[PDB]
Homo-oligomer: A and B are copies of this chain.
Amino acid sequence: NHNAQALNTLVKQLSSKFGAISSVLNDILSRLDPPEAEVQIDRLITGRLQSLQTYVTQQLIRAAEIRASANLAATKMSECVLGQSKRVDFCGKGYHLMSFPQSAPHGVVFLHVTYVPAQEKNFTTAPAICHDGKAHFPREGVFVSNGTHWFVTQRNFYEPQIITTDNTFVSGNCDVVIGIVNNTVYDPLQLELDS
């Protein structure tokens, strides 16, 4: 629309007279003789030339905006389509899984497949888990409790496991962590090595 609009305002500015007796040059030439025509034609030329100036200048500004937008569509191509983005809300709302490009007239359309969490559930949490006077932090998860028992799930999906000692790691004593709770960290060895 903006392009056809500025390309129509350009044409329909040919029939403006800018202060000439008429717009038609053929007329002013078949009519009034050279010198007194040179005056009018000079007005029409100044006008019809500043009209092109404004057209071109408006299109150099519009084209800088399309370039700013085709450098973003080129970035979104490389990062969303040819990869998996971690930049938030870059490739669609959610956690980006992948994107698919689809062409369109004078543009591109990305279908951003994202992973949205759903059906949350309150739990009770804890920074660490004091077992032997030593604090146990989760190795790659979070401690939750279904009210009575403690587990260690991944942070993005409720999948509770038993707090063993190979999904938690130890550091220090239960004396400095604010909010630590007492619980049992099941060791697979001592269970096995109680032969």
Supply 5 further A-B pairs (C-beta < 8 A) apart from A61-B64, A64-B65: A57-B57, A68-B68, A78-B90, A79-B88, A189-B192
Q: Contacts A61-B64, A67-B65 known; A79 to B83 CB distance under 8 Å?
A: no
| Interface size range of chain A in the complex | 20 to 34
Mask, A1-26, CB within 8 Å of B = 1, is 00000000000000000010000000
Mask, A37-79, CB within 8 Å of B = 1, is 0100010001000100110011011001101100110010011
A-B contact pairs, 14 of them (CB 8 A): A60-B61, A61-B61, A64-B64, A64-B68, A71-B72, A75-B87, A78-B90, A79-B87, A83-B86, A83-B89, A86-B86, A159-B171, A189-B192, A193-B195
Contact B88 A83 (CB under 8 A): yes
Q: What distance in Å separates the Cβ of A20 from its nearest Cβ neighbour in chain B?
A: 11
Q: Which residues of A contact B (CB under 8 A)?
A: 19, 38, 42, 46, 50, 53-54, 57-58, 60-61, 64-65, 67-68, 71-72, 75, 78-79, 82-83, 85-90, 159, 171, 189, 192-193, 195
Residues of B within 8 A of A192 (CB): 189, 193
Q: What distance in Å separates the Cβ of A60 from its nearest Cβ neighbour in chain B?
A: 5
